[PDB]
Amino acid sequence: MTNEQVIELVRVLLGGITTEEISDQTIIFFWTKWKLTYDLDNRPEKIPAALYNTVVDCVRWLIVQEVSSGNSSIRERFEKIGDETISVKSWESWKDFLDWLELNPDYIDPSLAFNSSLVIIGGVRKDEFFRVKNNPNSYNGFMEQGVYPTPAIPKQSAWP
Amino acid sequence: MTNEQVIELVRVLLGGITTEEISDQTIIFFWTKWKLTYDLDNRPEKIPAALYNTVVDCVRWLIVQEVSSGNSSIRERFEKIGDETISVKSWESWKDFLDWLELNPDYIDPSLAFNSSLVIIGGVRKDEFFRVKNNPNSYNGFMEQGVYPTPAIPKQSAWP
Amino acid sequence: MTNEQVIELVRVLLGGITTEEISDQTIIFFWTKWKLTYDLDNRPEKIPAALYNTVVDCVRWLIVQEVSSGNSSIRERFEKIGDETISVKSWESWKDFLDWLELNPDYIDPSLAFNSSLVIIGGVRKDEFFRVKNNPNSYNGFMEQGVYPTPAIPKQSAWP
Amino acid sequence: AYSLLSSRNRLIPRVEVQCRKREWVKTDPDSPFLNGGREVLYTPFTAVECTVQPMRGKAIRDQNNQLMIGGEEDYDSYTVYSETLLFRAREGTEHLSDQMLLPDSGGGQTWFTVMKADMYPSSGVPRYRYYLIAVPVGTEGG
Amino acid sequence: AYSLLSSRNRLIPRVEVQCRKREWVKTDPDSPFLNGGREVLYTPFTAVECTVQPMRGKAIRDQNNQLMIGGEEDYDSYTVYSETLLFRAREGTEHLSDQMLLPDSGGGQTWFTVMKADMYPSSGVPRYRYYLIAVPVGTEGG
Amino acid sequence: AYSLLSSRNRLIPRVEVQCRKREWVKTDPDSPFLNGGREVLYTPFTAVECTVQPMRGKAIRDQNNQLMIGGEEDYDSYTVYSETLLFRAREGTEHLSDQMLLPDSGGGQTWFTVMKADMYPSSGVPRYRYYLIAVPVGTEGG
């Protein structure tokens, strides 16, 4: 993806967010950070992964933007300069959205292979059995040397 | 990293915090603290580590800035010098952000190797098994001398 | 550390606290107290320890400063001398900060060796085993004399 | 000291208005009078932010068009809250009262002359209240 | 800026009313007077939505039928809130005050002449308040 | 007895003001009159802490600049809350009313003369209210 498409895509995904709420320079800053770490030009397979992380970081910057200003710590207002009176009572709204977004990554890109390896059962596949068995660093139960080593007990996991 | 980029990077990460809220002097003070403890010039492998501690320390100084002033202990205000009336009601917001930031270090630098060694199981690796076994200071169960020492029981952990 | 650096360091750590909130004389009073007890001039290894305790004592003096005055026991105010009305409703804020500070001593000095000996397991080190075994004052299970003493039971913990 | 009122509001909209200072001068060379042929000198300026409101009642002297023996004359007034300092006339001097341009009931724009200014010297915050009366139609006031 | 007041209400019913603009013209060919034989020209129109309310007190000048040496004369008035702009008379011109037709205490319908118009130039929302007086019975006002 | 009001406030800012006492004396050696050539003697002092506020209405006599047949005269007034005792004039004596210096609508500073003083003898706390009127421009009052 080029530098101009990312701002176009992020703004649409964030419900048409405006420039003052989030500048185009900040989006490039997070976009560039994941470009150098994932060398997207070298391997184009990380386009969905780099795109998903970029949006999440932008939401994080939005939350901290409410902080460091007076918006986060106020929950009341009252103006009265005569006959005009106004009283109203997004920091908390951005919170659960970030939690919700991390649970539905398909909203960004459906090809993220999300939710595929929840349950793992060991010893029910030949591919997984031999990979563990043939690992030279593996130490299993058949290596119990006891008091002092004896040649009756194997020193390697793999079968001869 | 040089003395000027740290301020530029910190402000962007903190959502464009202003100069009056945190001076550039205080940022250097915490930046210099970790430079001498991690000799960044001698070993550049600690650039992410020094950067992470610098940002966290700045947030800590921000929290104590609300304390030691009237901002922390007040939760109401009311002004009236005639017809003008105003009533409104960051110490609490900066608290949870520090807790959140301590749980998401990837927001600062993805290369921090966060969350990699949660679960440890002993005796399932040859590298770790021999490290403990060959340790001259190790004392294991096969050394139970009893009432008085006997030459039938080893005095060293490593096998001959 | 000299007498002038400590005030400079404490004020920065406390978020730029002012002179009226805490005088420079009180800081010296607590600084001097830990100097004579830890003879910093004799052993410069206690610079972090004396510095950490000095800041904690200052926070304690800040809490008791809210007490012994009207600030602690009031939670309302109302002034009305005509058209000017003001109504607002740090003793409790300094409380949890002292609790928080005692849990994060690295904020003062990272070289305090904090959080290093939480879990202790006995009998798994030769250094710890022989120190207890060779202690002349130690009394273990192999000394059970029973009804009256007999020469079949050792009177010293260390092996011959 | 006051803190909240020492800063600009953030709920009620405020606007800026234009104003102009006023002096006077004698022109006749031989007339023995201080009046002479009076002239007024102007120097424009603006108010930082202001709020305009109309009179609250319906008293006969506060109505807009008034019936006189000549014809249906015109009248307007306002109450203004502002953070700029405006001055009335001072005696034994050549300074006149400040004026500021505001919309009227006839759809046009006309000059209003400051008549009453309220200040709170002991409070400190720079917030003022003014009362204004529209200049007679066809003239520049006095 | 104001948002809620910048939109039409949805709880209190509002109605539209009819109005008419007014000018005047000289007809006499030889009379040297600006008056001449005065005539008034009308151009009708309507107000988008309005609310009509009566005077609140019972003062002697606000009563409907009044006893004069000739006979029991007639009088009526109202206070109107509207989102249409109506203008009063302006001097040195040929424009007169707008009028609008409303029901009266006698069961009929008569024209009311705008006398006082209130505006808030610094707020922005187009909401106005007017004060109206019924035209004398048997004439078209002035 | 009152406790809270018997102590200085800690929310609303208060300021100190300057004042001056006033007597009078006869100067003419041969004139048979008590007036003679009257003179006033002053002795300055200050008020511990005070609050100044302006008149609340817009009545014609409370406006700042007033139109008279001579020229646009000047007028100002205030209401003051203070913890210092100030005295009015007393008859059959040579004492006059105290005065105190405050800012005016023209940007300068002028003397105000005490006209009404309010006290609560049965309460005990020393809190007073005063009403002041600016001295005529170009003179020192009476």
PDB file of C-alpha atoms in Angstrom, chain B residues 8 10 12 16 21 24 61 83 94 133-134 156:
ATOM      1  CA  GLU B   8      10.151  14.923  19.793  1.00  0.00           C
ATOM      2  CA  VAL B  10       7.981  11.492  23.738  1.00  0.00           C
ATOM      3  CA  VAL B  12       4.123  12.335  19.901  1.00  0.00           C
ATOM      4  CA  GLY B  16       1.093  15.953  21.655  1.00  0.00           C
ATOM      5  CA  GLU B  21       2.520  20.562  31.244  1.00  0.00           C
ATOM      6  CA  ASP B  24      11.888  19.683  28.048  1.00  0.00           C
ATOM      7  CA  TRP B  61       6.292  12.858  37.237  1.00  0.00           C
ATOM      8  CA  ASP B  83     -23.978  37.864  35.663  1.00  0.00           C
ATOM      9  CA  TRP B  94      -3.242   9.577  34.520  1.00  0.00           C
ATOM     10  CA  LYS B 133      23.340 -30.416  37.144  1.00  0.00           C
ATOM     11  CA  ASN B 134      26.798 -29.001  36.360  1.00  0.00           C
ATOM     12  CA  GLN B 156      29.079 -33.027  44.014  1.00  0.00           C
TER      13      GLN B 156
END
